[PDB]
Amino acid sequence: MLSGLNHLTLAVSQLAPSVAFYQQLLGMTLHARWDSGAYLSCGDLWLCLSLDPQRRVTPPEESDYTHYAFSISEADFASFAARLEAAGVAVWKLNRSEGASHYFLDPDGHKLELHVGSLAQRLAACREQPYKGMVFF
Amino acid sequence: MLSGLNHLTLAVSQLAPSVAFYQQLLGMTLHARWDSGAYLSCGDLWLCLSLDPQRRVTPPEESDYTHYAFSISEADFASFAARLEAAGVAVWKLNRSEGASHYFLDPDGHKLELHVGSLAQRLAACREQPYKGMVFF
Ligand SMILES: Cc1cc(CNCCS(C)(=O)=O)ccc1Br
Ligand SMILES: [Mn+2]
Ligand SMILES: [Mn+2]
C-alpha cells in the first residue's frame, strides 16, 4: 500500500532564488544542487526544486487553494512568521480557519504555510468548533 | 525551525470523486469530511482535500512539473500500478530515473507519482553518476 509522501517536487522558474528561499530563508537542509534542480530536506521531508521553463510566477488570486504546510513548534512559530514578514515575504491568507497558521508565498507564488499542530490536534479542535457539516470517522 | 511537512492540501473541483480516488482507489484513511473538504492520512502524511470553485481540471500539458510522490514498497509497486491502470487513471510521464516510479493524474489533473526509494538512495546514485553541474554539501 501507500505509506506516506515520498517527496514533494516544486517547479521553479529561477533555480538560484528558489534555493536561497528554501535554504537560507526557511532553513531547510541543502543536500545537492545541479544546473536544473536541487534536493533539500526538512526533517523527514524530501523536497526537490526542479527548474521548469513552464513555471510561471503566479499571483495568489490566480491559483487555487492547493498549498504546502510545514511544521513548526509553538515556541518558534511567531518569531519565524515575523521574520518572514520583516523580510518582505508576500502573503496570501490572513484568516486562521485551520488553527495556528501563517500563510506565505515562495518566489514563484507556490502557496506555503507554517502550521502548529498535528492532524490529531486539528480533529480534536474541530470537534469543539467543527467545519460546517463535519462528520468524523 | 521547520521540522517537516505538516500537511498537503489539494484543491478539488468535486469532493465526492476526489474522496473516492484518495480513499477507495489509493487506500488512504478518511478521518473527517465536511461540506467543503476532507482530511485523510497516508502513513505520516496529512492530506486535506479542499473543495475549491477555482480548481480547473487541468490537462498535464498545461501544468508545470510540480508533483506529489507517494512511497510504496518495490514488492507492492507493480500491482498498485496495475490497479490504477484498471481504474483508467491516466499517466503523465514515463520513468527514466533511478527507483521505480509511476506517474499518474488525479481527477483534477494534480500530478502524482508512486516512487520506490529514499533521498539517501537518490543521493548515492547521483554521487556515482552526477547530474550536469551537480555539487554536494
Ligand atoms: C552557490 C552555487 C551557485 C551555482 C551557480 N553558478 C553560476 C556560475 S555562472 C558564471 O554560470 O553564472 C551553482 C552551485 C552553487 Br553551490
Ligand atoms: Mn493548510
Ligand atoms: Mn518525482
Author numbering:
A (entry chain A), B (entry chain B): 1 to 137
Question: Which statements did the authors publish about this structure?
Answer:
Over all screens, a total of 31 out of 95 fragments are observed binding to FosAKP. For comparison, the same screen was conducted with conventional single crystal data collection at cryogenic temperatures (100 K) from loop-mounted crystals at beamline P11 at PETRA III. In total, 7 fragments bind in the two RT screens, of which 3 bind to pharmaceutically relevant sites 1, 2 and 4. In contrast, 31 fragments are observed binding in the cryo screens, but only 6 of these bind to the more interesting sites 1-4.
Here we systematically compare RT fragment screening of the Fosfomycin-resistance protein A from Klebsiella pneumoniae (FosAKP), an enzyme involved in antibiotic resistance, with conventional single crystal data collection at cryogenic temperature (cryo). Fosfomycin, a broad-spectrum antibiotic, is routinely used to treat urinary infections. However, natural resistance can exist in gram-negative bacteria, mainly through the enzyme Fosfomycin-resistance protein A (FosA), that catalyzes the Mn2+ and K+-dependent glutathione mediated inactivation of Fosfomycin. Therefore, increased interest exists to identify inhibitors of FosA to enable the use of Fosfomycin to also treat resistant strains24.
